[PDB]
Structures are given as structure tokens and as C-alpha cells.
Amino acid sequence: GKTFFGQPLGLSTLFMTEMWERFSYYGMRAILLYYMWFLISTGDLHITRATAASIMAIYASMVYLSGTIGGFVADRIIGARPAVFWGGVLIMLGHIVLALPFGASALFGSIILIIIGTGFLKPNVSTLVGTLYDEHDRRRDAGFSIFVFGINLGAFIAPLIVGAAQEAAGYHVAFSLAAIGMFIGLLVYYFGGKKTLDPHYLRPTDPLAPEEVKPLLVKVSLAVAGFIAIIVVMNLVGWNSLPAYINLLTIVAIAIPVFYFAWMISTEHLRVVSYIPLFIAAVLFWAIEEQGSVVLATFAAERVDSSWFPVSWFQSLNPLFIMLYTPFFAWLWTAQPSSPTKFAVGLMFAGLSFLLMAIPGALYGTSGKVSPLWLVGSWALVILGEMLISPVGLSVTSMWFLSSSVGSALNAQLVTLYNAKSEVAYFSYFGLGSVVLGIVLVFLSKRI
Numbered sequence: 001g002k003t004f005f006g007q008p009l010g011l012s013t014l015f016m017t018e019m020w021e022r023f024s025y026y027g028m029r030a031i032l033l034y035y036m037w038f039l040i041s042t043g044d045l046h047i048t049r050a051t052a053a054s055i056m057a058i059y060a061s062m063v064y065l066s067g068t069i070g071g072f073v074a075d076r077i078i079g080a081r082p083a084v085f086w087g088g089v090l091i092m093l094g095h096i097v098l099a100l101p102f103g104a105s106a107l108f109g110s111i112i113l114i115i116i117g118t119g120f121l122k123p124n125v126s127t128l129v130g131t132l133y134d135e136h137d138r139r140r141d142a143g144f145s146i147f148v149f150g151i152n153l154g155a156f157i158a159p160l161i162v163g164a165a166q167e168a169a170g171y172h173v174a175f176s177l178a179a180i181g182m183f184i185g186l187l188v189y190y191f192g193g194k195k196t197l198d199p200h201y202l203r204p205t206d207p208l209a210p211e212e213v214k215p216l217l218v219k220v221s222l223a224v225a226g227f228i229a230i231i232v233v234m235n236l237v238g239w240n241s242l243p244a245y246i247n248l249l250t251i252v253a254i255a256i257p258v259f260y261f262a263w264m265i266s267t268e269h270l271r272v273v274s275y276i277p278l279f280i281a282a283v284l285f286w287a288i289e290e291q292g293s294v295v296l297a298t299f300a301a302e303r304v305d306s307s308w309f310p311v312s313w314f315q316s317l318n319p320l321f322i323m324l325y326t327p328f329f330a331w332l333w334t335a336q337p338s339s340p341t342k343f344a345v346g347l348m349f350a351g352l353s354f355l356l357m358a359i360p361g362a363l364y365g366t367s368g369k370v371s372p373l374w375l376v377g378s379w380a381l382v383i384l385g386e387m388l389i390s391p392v393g394l395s396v397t398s399m400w401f402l403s404s405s406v407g408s409a410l411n412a413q414l415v416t417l418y419n420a421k422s423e424v425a426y427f428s429y430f431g432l433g434s435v436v437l438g439i440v441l442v443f444l445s446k447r448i
């Protein structure tokens with residue numbers, strides 16, 4: 001129908017490709033924690049709920065950390081369009097694995113398939129959106145807003161459809177629905193891409209030169225050997241527990257930025273030095289925002305009297321508030337504060353969302369059930385902070401893609417401190433710590 005919301009026709013294919021990837025990812029994301037609880041509940045999965053909560057966080061962390069390499073692989077080894085397709089195949093296979101009649105045994109294979117596949121697909125689907133606007137186009141900003149709208153839309157309907165299906169039929173039937181969404185995205189992506197997309201991106205745009213293959217091989221091989229060497233030393237010293245492997249990835253996930261930062265601090269260097277508070281602010285915000293899939297999901301199931309609807313539906317509040325807030329903040333910023341002071345306020349709101357959640361337990365006690373409106377207000381606050389941090393954050397800096405992996409890595413340690421006895425302290429303490437750190441950044445907003 002000629003333009004798609006004024007944008008080139010190929011936005012529709014990419015819009016829907018990622019809408020269905022996000023449907024498959026976030027639909028699984030809404031019921032995976034309850035799935036592990038269920039597997040624990042029947043004795044099939046021998047971990048604590050604290051460990052089940054830490055897996056959700058470190059699972060997310062690796063997915064974002066898989067996304068920093070995906071652009072490289074498609075820009076230099078395979079194509080951008082092949083990375084999205086074959087990434088989608090891996091995400092679909094990851095969900096098929098959980099739909100099969102397995103239990104805990106399938107969990108690792110599903111997690112590893114989706115980590116790799118999302119890493120190939122997620123950065124390069126955004127790359128293909130840029131290829132629609134050849135160069136120096138005003139439409140670019142609008143078309144990415146359309147693309148992101150399909151992202152949030154798929155994240156919004158997925159807990160509704162997949163969560164209700166888990167309620168209706170099994171967990172396995174619900175996971176197959178996630179697999180089917182990715183399949184739908186592949187159909188539209190494949191047949192729709194052939195018609196629209198540039199055949200230039202069937203092939204790497206910056207292919208490896210003859211002399212670059214061997215150093216890259218050495219580099220990737222040295223990384224795997226040392227990583228494999230660490231793992232065998234762990235088991236030798238007796239650190240072979242699942243919580244210990246999560247700590248390895250935690251250390252790995254946080255050391256990558258630290259090493260890049262210490263690297264660049266080794267010519268008006270203080271521009272870099274300026275980014276440390278900005279980066280730390282992004283990590284703590286993403287930590288709180290990514291705990292909604294974990295800590296807030298636990299609260300909804302254990303602590304909210306939600307007996308007339310599936311508890312996983314609370315995951316739809318995150319993209320819903322993004323979609324309601326997003327046209328406003330577009331209007332708001334065309335009619336303005338700095339990038340650092342935007343970060344601090346974002347962490348303040350994020351901290352306000354956790355402070356709000358400390359109130360019901362303090363007032364009513366912890367052995368009962370509270371209104372679902374508490375969680376509704378909590379997500380309203382944290383997504384408010386996302387509007388300030390996210391659209392601005394990429395500009396102030398990818399190394400910013402990594403802030404999400406570190407926040408979830410930190411989460412893999414913190415969420416194990418959450419339970420009913422620790423509820424009010426967890427929310428209040430970490431919620432206050434975020435707001436206070438936002439005050440320090442407002443003080444530090446002077447220097448940049």
C-alpha cells in the first residue's frame with residue numbers, strides 16, 4: 001500500500017519480524033520463572049526459588065551480552081539478513097525445546113539456543129531498518145519509532161496470549177505458542193524480505209580481509225580456552241555448583257565493561273572519566289527495570305490477590321506504559337535538561353518504584369495479599385525513568401548495549417536476597433540506594 005505510516009514499505013516486514021520475536025521472547029519471559037517454580041514444586045528441578053530467580057537475571061544478562069557480538073558477526077562474517085533469519089531459527093528452536101515433553105533437562109539447551117539466536121537477530125534487525133533509509137533522511141527518526149512500536153506491541157500482547165494459554169493448556173502448550181510467534185516472524189521476514197530488502201545485505205558489508213582471519217581465529221580461540229580453563233579449575237577446587245557458574249558469568253559480565261573502561265583510561269581523557277557515573281547510573285536503572293521479570297513477578301504470584309486472571313499478565317505493564325508514555329515524551333522534548341541530569345532523574349524514578357513497593361508490607365504486613373494496583377504504580381514509575389534514560393542514553397555515549405547486561409548480572413546476585421521475610425527491606429534499601437545515587441549524580445551533573 002505504498003508507504004507504511006509514511007515510511008518505506010519494508011518497514012512493515014521488519015516491524016512485524018521483530019514484533020513476533022519480542023512476542024516469543026517476552027511471552028516465554030512471562031512464564032519461565034513460574035515454570036521453574038513448578039519444576040521445583042514437583043521435585044523435578046532441584047534448585048531453590050532464589051536460584052530460580054538468579055537464573056532469570058543471568059539469562060537476560062547473556063542475551064544482551066550476546067547482542068554486542070551479533071552486529072560484528074553479520075557485518076564481517078555472514079550477512080545482516082542471514083543473521084536475522086538464522087538467529088530467528090535458533091530462537092524458534094529454543095522455544096520448541098521447552099514445548100517438548102521434558103523438564104529441567106531441556107532448560108539449559110533452551111537458554112543457550114535463545115542466547116545465541118537473539119544475539120544474531122536483535123542487533124541486525126535494527127541494522128536492516130537503517131538500510132531502508134539510504135542516507136541523510138529525515139524519515140529515519142520516525143521509522144525507528146514505528147519499529148520500536150512494533151517491539152513494544154509484541155512485548156505487550158505476549159504475556160496476555162501466552163500467559164492465558166499456560167492457564168488454559170499446559171506450560172508446554174504455552175511455550176509452543178512462543179515458538180509459533182517466532183515462526184510467524186520468520187515467514188513474514190523471509191518472504192517479505194525477498195520482496196523489499198536490499199540484496200546487498202545477503203552478504204557481509206565489511207568482509208574479513210585475507211590477513212584478518214587468523215588473528216580473529218586466535219582471538220576467539222584464546223577466549224574460549226581461558227574460559228574453559230577457568231571452568232575446569234572451578235570444578236577442581238569444588239566450585240561446581242549452579243550458583244557458582246552464575247557467579248562466573250556475573251564476574252565475566254561485569255569485568256568486560258570494567259576492562260574496556262580501564263582500557264580507555266590508558267588527551268582530554270576526562271570525557272571518558274565523565275561516563276563512569278553515567279554508566280553506573282545506567283547499570284543500576286536496568287537492574288531495577290529488569291527485576292520486574294524476576295522480583296516483581298514473584299511478588300505478583302505470591303503476594304497479590306490475582307485469582308481472577310493469570311499472574312503473568314503483569315509483565316504486559318512494562319511495554320504498555322512504554323507505549324502510553326512514548327508519544328508524550330516525543331511531544332515533550334520538541335518543546336530541556338542535560339543528559340547527565342536526565343540519567344539521575346531516571347535512577348530516582350527507578351528508585352521511587354522500589355520505594356513504593358516497600359509500603360504495602362510495612363503497612364499491611366507480609367503474610368497477606370495486596371491490591372494489584374501497587375504493581376501497576378510500580379511499573380508506571382520505573383518506565384517513567386526509562387523514558388528519560390533510554391532515548392537520551394544512546395546519544396550521550398555498543399558500550400551502552402552492555403549497561404543492560406551488567407544490570408542483569410548484578411541482578412543475578414541481588415534477587416537471591418528477595419523473599420517474604422526480606423521483602424520490605426529489599427525494596428526499601430535498594431530503592432533508597434538508587435534515589436540517593438541519583439542525588440549524587442545531580443551534584444555531579446555540574447561537571448558534564
Ligand SMILES: CCCCCCC/C=C\CCCCCC(=O)OC[C@@H](O)CO
Pocket residue numbers: 062065066068069070072073115116119120220
Ligand atoms: C554471550 C556470547 C554469546 C555469543 C553468541 C553470538 C556470537 C557468536 C560467536 C562470537 C565470535 C565472534 C567474534 C567476537 C568478536 O570479536 O566481537 C567483537 C566485536 O563485537 C567488537 O565490536
Ligand SMILES: CCCCCCC/C=C\CCCCCC(=O)OC[C@@H](O)CO
Pocket residue numbers: 055058059062104107108111112115227242249252
Ligand atoms: C565467555 C562466554 C560467556 C558465557 C555465555 C554462555 C552462557 C550459557 C549459559 C548461561 C545462561 C544462564 C545459565 C542458567 C542455567 O544454568 O540454567 C540451567 C539449569 O537450570 C539446568 O539445571
Ligand SMILES: CCCCCCC/C=C\CCCCCC(=O)OC[C@@H](O)CO
Pocket residue numbers: 076077207208209210213216217220
Ligand atoms: C561455528 C564455528 C565456530 C565459530 C566461528 C568463529 C569465527 C571466528 C573466526 C573465523 C572466521 C570465519 C570466517 C572466515 C572468512 O570468511 O574469511 C575469509 C575472507 O577471505 C573473506 O571473508
Ligand SMILES: CCCCCCC/C=C\CCCCCC(=O)OC[C@@H](O)CO
Pocket residue numbers: 352355356358359361362363424428
Ligand atoms: C512519587 C510517589 C512515590 C511514593 C513512594 C515513596 C515511598 C517512600 C517511603 C516508603 C518506605 C517504606 C519503608 C518501610 C518501613 O518503614 O520499614 C518499617 C516496616 O517494616 C514496619 O513494619
Ligand SMILES: CCCCCCC/C=C\CCCCCC(=O)OC[C@@H](O)CO
Pocket residue numbers: 359362363
Ligand atoms: C510520597 C507519598 C507518601 C509516601 C509516604 C511514605 C510511606 C511511609 C510509610 C508507610 C507506612 C509504613 C509504616 C511502618 C510503621 O510505622 O511500622 C510500625 C510498626 O510496624 C512497628 O513495628
Ligand SMILES: CCCCCCC/C=C\CCCCCC(=O)OC[C@@H](O)CO
Pocket residue numbers: 356360364368369370371373374377378380381
Ligand atoms: C504512582 C501511583 C501509585 C499508586 C499506587 C497505590 C495504590 C494502592 C492501593 C489502592 C487500592 C487500595 C487497596 C489497598 C490494598 O492493597 O488492599 C489491602 C487489603 O487487602 C488488606 O486487607
Ligand SMILES: CCCCCCC/C=C\CCCCCC(=O)OC[C@@H](O)CO
Pocket residue numbers: 305313314316317320369370371372373376
Ligand atoms: C492491560 C494489561 C495489564 C494487565 C494488568 C493486570 C490487571 C491489573 C490491575 C487491575 C486491578 C483492578 C482492581 C482489582 C481488584 O479487584 O482488587 C483486588 C483487591 O484485593 C484490592 O485490594
Ligand SMILES: CCCCCCC/C=C\CCCCCC(=O)OC[C@@H](O)CO
Pocket residue numbers: 243280410412413414416417
Ligand atoms: C556503586 C555501584 C552500586 C553497585 C551495587 C549496589 C548494591 C550492591 C550490593 C548491596 C549489598 C548486598 C550484598 C548481598 C549480595 O550481593 O548477595 C549476593 C549473594 O547472595 C550471591 O548469591
Ligand SMILES: CCCCCCC/C=C\CCCCCC(=O)OC[C@@H](O)CO
Pocket residue numbers: 442443445446447
Ligand atoms: C532529606 C529530607 C528532604 C530533603 C530533600 C530536599 C531536596 C534534596 C536536596 C536538594 C538539592 C541539594 C542540592 C542540589 C544541588 O545543589 O544541585 C546543584 C547542581 O545541579 C549543580 O550542577
